[PDB]
Amino acid sequence: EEKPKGALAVILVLTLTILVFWLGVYAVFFARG
Amino acid sequence: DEHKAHKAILAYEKGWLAFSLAMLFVFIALIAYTLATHTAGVIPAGKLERVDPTTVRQEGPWADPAQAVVQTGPNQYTVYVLAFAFGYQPNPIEVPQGAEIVFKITSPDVIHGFHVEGTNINVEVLPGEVSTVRYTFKRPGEYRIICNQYCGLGHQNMFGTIVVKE
Amino acid sequence: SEISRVYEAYPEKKATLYFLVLGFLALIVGSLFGPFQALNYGNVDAYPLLKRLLPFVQSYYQGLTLHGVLNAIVFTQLFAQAIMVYLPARELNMRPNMGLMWLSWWMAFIGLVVAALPLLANEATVLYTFYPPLKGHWAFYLGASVFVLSTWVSIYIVLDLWRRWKAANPGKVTPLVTYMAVVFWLMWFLASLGLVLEAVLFLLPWSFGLVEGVDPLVARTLFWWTGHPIVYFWLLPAYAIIYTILPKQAGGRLVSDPMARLAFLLFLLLSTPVGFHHQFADPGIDPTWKMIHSVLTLFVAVPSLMTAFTVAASLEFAGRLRGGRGLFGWIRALPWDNPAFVAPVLGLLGFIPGGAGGIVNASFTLDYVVHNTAWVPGHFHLQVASLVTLTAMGSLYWLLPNLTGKPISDAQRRLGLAVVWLWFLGMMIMAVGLHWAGLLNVPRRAYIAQVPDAYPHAAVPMVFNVLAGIVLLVALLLFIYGLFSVLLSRERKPELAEAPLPFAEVISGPEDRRLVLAMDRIGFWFAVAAILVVLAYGPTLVQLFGHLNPVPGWRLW
Ligand code: HAS
Ligand code: HEM
């Protein structure tokens, strides 16, 4: 019918990980640099 | 439904295409950011730099590991290393706290790796080549050289040391 | 002249059944060490024992060499050749030339076994990358140059079926799965040179007795030419299944023809010019070639990224349809009780973290922090090991009945699920333990369990690893009493055999014409495809060939 929350909650979570993950590392790349 | 969904679908899949692309550059941004500050260094040797793993041990600066530490400017230090079957030359690598180091590392056999517990020194050591990274240490103490590259059977017994003196 | 009247007037199932099963066996054998390798990182020395079970096992590494070569080269390869072949026909209910198809088959099998034997003897423990200068048997490189060439065949069996359908259905658009096959097998050709060159030019003289050394550097820039895509090669056979079929397992419809030709368009375009993220840590390679293949790669996330929406949406709608209600409602709505379905979808959730590893992995300097720790094997175990494989496995439970006419009984329909979930956890439990340990500076490909004094903070992912061990063991076996027991029993009632492969439909679209034509521009983009490689392995491949530096090969195992 209308707005697909599902897919979105998803591409979000995804988004959220790729963030938890990429900053997460950056930070470390740094602590080591 | 069955075509009502489609107009929307497509356009959401724009939201994404766009949003994705942004994040992405924001990354390309930051990655690039690191290219401009010091921590860029641990990036290998652009440029080629050939030797051969037969003669290497016998002569060159990799012959005599007395001469591995080697002062090259009021703070720079080329440190010849020989990664090789199931140790590194020398053990340990005496080096100064808070000064620039400039590792020069090759093999006399198969490819090993050279990864320094606590850093971004981390680099493949190829027989026939001189890999060149620059790090600058910062804290006194010890740092294990793991070799994260299947040198063969003494593999998981291929560690080393670098002390960073006070 | 057959008790089952198949291979007489509709037998391209004869071959796909085969490509398949062997693929599978491959997979069973090589994963046999999996859970050992897992305790090794668990920190349990399961080798003495595994040495007993298999007398023939020389080195930890020899396991990991089978384990890796069997499952990620062999098994993933037979799957494509099986899917990207038996599907494209069927869409078009036309028969693939069958001389070639078995040439194709046999080629691999020769190749496999021509290969395999160096290996169980322990005469080629150089690991699935076979990094020269470490020097494996000649029959190992030979066995795999065959084997592989043998998809070079299947590039055309399918391009035959394009050629043929397209001409006698003319000014008509290749329906998805043969427009899909074609870009795949196509893009896979460009790729396929990388290795192929390294083998003809280097690996094959060197080993046979013919030169005495290979320069290590172009060994693995040539190596990794291909060596990247080949993951994308492993995975796309499953992105087909998922894109075009799953939604009807789901009991709903692909939301979008274009977006699936589009994901695939990005593939053949962006898949092969990237083998310097694998080489972020190599010497003698100009920093800005790496910085590029940073961005190229990144651009290649775009597809699976934007698959994750198509796919998620499609399963969204299907949930709504069969009952789905809330923000997550639409989920219990889905088939949970059907393996055909369950497997790939788990494979997908898994897939989310693994995507995010992939990226880091590709953000150049960031890789300095993980390149060659437990990180990586986390990553791909998550990717190729959970996804492709769960996707492959799942597609047992409709592609057997179809292929065999033998029908899945509630017996193993119920056990399939026990297998699937009981394996999916493994991955996870393990994945966390690799990433973990990995961040912890634990090298990969390393009998760490033999220096058990050594990674003392590894402490705990190490439990996680160990446990995965026990769990995936349980998981693996189970799947033998499956794969075997769901084939063993004679009981075949091939009313089902007759094969309406569960294809899905489209939310038949608007721009689905002036546009989905542009993507059917096959040959054109296949030239921007070759155009790109050409600049990618541009003044770096040419380069190093000015200054090759062959070196003696060593065998230190
Ligand atoms: C089949 C296989 C693979 C695919 C998948 C894969 C994807 C990527 N990888 Fe990788 N990889 C690397 C970077 C990437 C990147 C950027 C991607 C991209 O494809 C990632 C894009 C993918 C995503 C962004 C995932 C999005 C999720 C989606 C699209 C699904 C959503 C799920 C849904 C919707 C289910 C929802 C349903 C419900 C019901 C709720 C790098 C570095 O650049 C290395 C070497 C690093 C080093 O230092 O050695 C590397 C190493 C590997 C090697 C190991 C190296 C070796 O053996 O020596 C193999 C095993 C491998 C396989 C595969 N890899 N990768
Ligand atoms: C049976 C369950 C499995 C377990 C417990 C398992 C575990 C592991 C572990 C612990 C490693 C690390 C070896 C090391 O880093 O020294 C590894 C390697 C690897 N696995 Fe498995 N794995 C399994 C199944 C699979 C499957 C199905 C595939 C194919 C998609 C796969 C592909 C690979 C590859 C390509 C490597 C690395 C090859 C190499 O590093 O030479 N694994 N596995």
Ligand code: CUA
């Ligand atoms: Cu040197 Cu492993």
Ligand SMILES: [Cu+]
């Ligand atoms: Cu890759």
